[PDB]
Design a protein around this ligand. Structure first.
Ligand SMILES: Cc1cc2nc3c(=O)[nH]c(=O)nc-3n(C[C@H](O)[C@H](O)[C@H](O)COP(=O)(O)OP(=O)(O)OC[C@H]3O[C@@H](n4cnc5c(N)ncnc54)[C@H](O)[C@@H]3O)c2cc1C
Ligand SMILES: NC(=O)C1=CN([C@@H]2O[C@H](COP(=O)(O)OP(=O)(O)OC[C@H]3O[C@@H](n4cnc5c(N)ncnc54)[C@H](OP(=O)(O)O)[C@@H]3O)[C@@H](O)[C@H]2O)C=CC1
Length: 453
């Protein structure tokens, strides 16, 4: 028999793990593999579908690789299966030789400041999910009519949020953005987005192309007060690294521009949100100025000066990181939002593993998940081999049929690969006549009406 591996999740780390497993079988005698991928949503690809911005279709093309992997007859997909709800980790661990958790980071980091819960104060996780038609975020429905939005954070997600808020809706109308978001963006209500970073430009987590592309937003001026660069030297930037050096050159270029009438994306550094205020919804934000100080760890940290400024704003999006969510039956580190593991093996488990953002934390481009997944798979395979040599492998009967019947009993509305392919075809056909790659089905009900049909 082949080894039977379950992968929970269907994003990049899951697909890289699947490919690694199949490659091991393809290149090793007396080693065969079967992979079942269980995904919470009806649709695969994780953040490649629901995260990557709609104005970045090229980045999403990695999905073609995932499709090629899924064509393998040893691979099966079961969508609309929520591990922790329909089936439990302890059940998967009995039915498979090994289980790989590739669940990503499904929630958000909080600011932990007063007023964070007011209507109009949301996380980028929820805003992005909403504009990318993730079914869990269909009702986020932010009011985008007010003149000023504030985005907290200095990572690339903050830039995506700002771009979507300010890009000409006629441009967004040709993307796979959610129709509900397009409708809210058509009025062009937001005139200014202020991106607020707690540390300085040298500590920004932005990457360079992402900063450069802001120059190509029709109708938007990037605004950086030259004072934001005081004390920021090219020598110190180079000491941080090559990306930082390039970033600072780009930022200086923006700061060199002096304009009324245009939409504005403003960068403010050394500033922290202190409190969000308003009567029943966000109306203003209190900001504090920071200075950079060595904390003894090898970095600089922001230290509050105590100064306070209030700025009117009608939307605050915190882009201060995604965050893992605990899975019933598995260990979890609350502080980091990751599952504790050694070489990818989950603490305390002989046959459960992690890959991707749930293993490493929520950082890295798509490709950073590849070596990560390979490393975990190498450990997994070594461990199975040891078990086999010790005559400790599970005994399984037509096991593949039996596990599929169990999944169907637990989730009669599961979505197989063939049915995902119907959803996919529906969405693409909806978009292409309108110049869009696809129009996404934005709710579970709509997805299932087509997928289960
Ligand atoms: C907003 C945003 C934009 C990004 N844009 C880019 C970009 O332009 N370029 C780039 O290279 N990288 C980009 N990235 C980074 C990229 O998205 C990540 O590196 C990558 O997706 C992480 O992969 P993952 O497999 O760990 O998690 P994910 O892609 O999040 O996949 C996790 C999967 O697990 C599923 N899942 C979760 N819990 C369960 C459960 N209990 N049961 C079953 N299934 C479950 C989810 O539904 C999902 O499909 C972006 C990230 C974000 C957040
Ligand atoms: N085009 C691309 O390549 C894209 C890639 N991705 C990537 O996905 C990953 C996730 O991006 P993202 O979610 O932006 O995460 P990042 O880790 O890149 O950025 C998080 C930001 O939040 C800041 N922050 C954290 N806590 C606070 C706080 N309490 N107050 C103020 N600021 C705070 C951090 O500042 P500090 O450094 O001070 O902690 C940092 O600027 C990144 O690796 C990113 O590059 C995402 C979008 C596009």
């Amino acid at each position: 028999r082949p080894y039977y591996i379950a992968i929970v999740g269907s994003g990049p780390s899951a697909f890289f793990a699947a490919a690694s497993l199949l490659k091991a079988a393809d290149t090793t005698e007396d080693l065969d593999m079967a992979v079942d991928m269980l995904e919470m949503l009806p649709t695969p690809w994780g953040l490649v579908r629901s995260g990557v911005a709609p104005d970045h279709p090229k980045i999403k093309s990695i999905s073609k690789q995932f499709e090629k992997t899924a064509e393998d007859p040893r691979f099966r997909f079961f969508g609309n299966v929520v591990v922790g709800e329909h089936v439990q980790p302890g059940e998967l661990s009995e039915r498979y030789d090994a289980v790989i958790y590739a669940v990503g980071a499904q929630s958000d980091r909080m600011l932990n400041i007063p007023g964070e819960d007011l209507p109009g104060s949301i996380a980028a996780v929820d805003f992005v999910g909403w504009y990318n038609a993730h079914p869990h975020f269909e009702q986020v429905s932010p009011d985008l009519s007010g003149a000023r939005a504030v985005v907290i954070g200095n990572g690339n997600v903050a830039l995506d949020v700002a771009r979507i808020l300010l890009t000409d809706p006629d441009v967004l109308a040709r993307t796979d953005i959610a129709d509900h978001a397009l409708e809210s963006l058509r009025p062009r209500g937001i005139q200014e987005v202020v991106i607020v970073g707690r540390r300085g430009p040298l500590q920004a987590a932005f990457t360079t192309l992402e900063l450069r592309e802001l120059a190509d937003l029709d109708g938007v001026d990037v605004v950086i007060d030259p004072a934001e660069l005081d004390g920021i030297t090219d020598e110190d930037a180079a000491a941080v690294g090559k990306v930082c050096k390039q970033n600072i050159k780009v930022l200086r270029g923006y700061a060199d521009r002096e304009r009324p009438g245009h939409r504005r994306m403003v960068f403010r550094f050394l500033t922290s949100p202190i409190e969000i205020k308003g009567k029943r919804k966000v109306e203003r934000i209190v900001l504090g100025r920071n200075e950079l100080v060595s904390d003894g760890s090898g970095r600089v940290a922001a230290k509050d000066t105590g100064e306070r400024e209030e700025l009117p704003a009608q939307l605050v999006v915190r882009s201060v990181g995604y965050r893992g969510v605990p899975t019933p039956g598995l260990p979890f580190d609350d502080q980091s939002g990751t599952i504790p593991n050694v070489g990818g093996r989950i603490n305390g488990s002989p046959n459960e593993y992690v890959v991707g953002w749930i293993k490493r934390g929520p950082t890295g481009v798509i490709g950073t998940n590849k070596k990560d997944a390979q490393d975990t798979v190498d450990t997994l395979i070594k461990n199975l081999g040891n078990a086999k040599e010790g005559a400790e492998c599970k005994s399984f009967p037509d096991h593949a049929d039996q596990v599929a019947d169990w999944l169907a009993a637990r989730q009669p509305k599961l979505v197989t690969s063939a049915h995902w392919q119907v959803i996919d075809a529906f969405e693409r056909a909806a978009g292409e006549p309108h110049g869009r790659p696809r129009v996404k089905l934005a709710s579970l009900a709509e997805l299932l009406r087509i997928g289960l049909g």
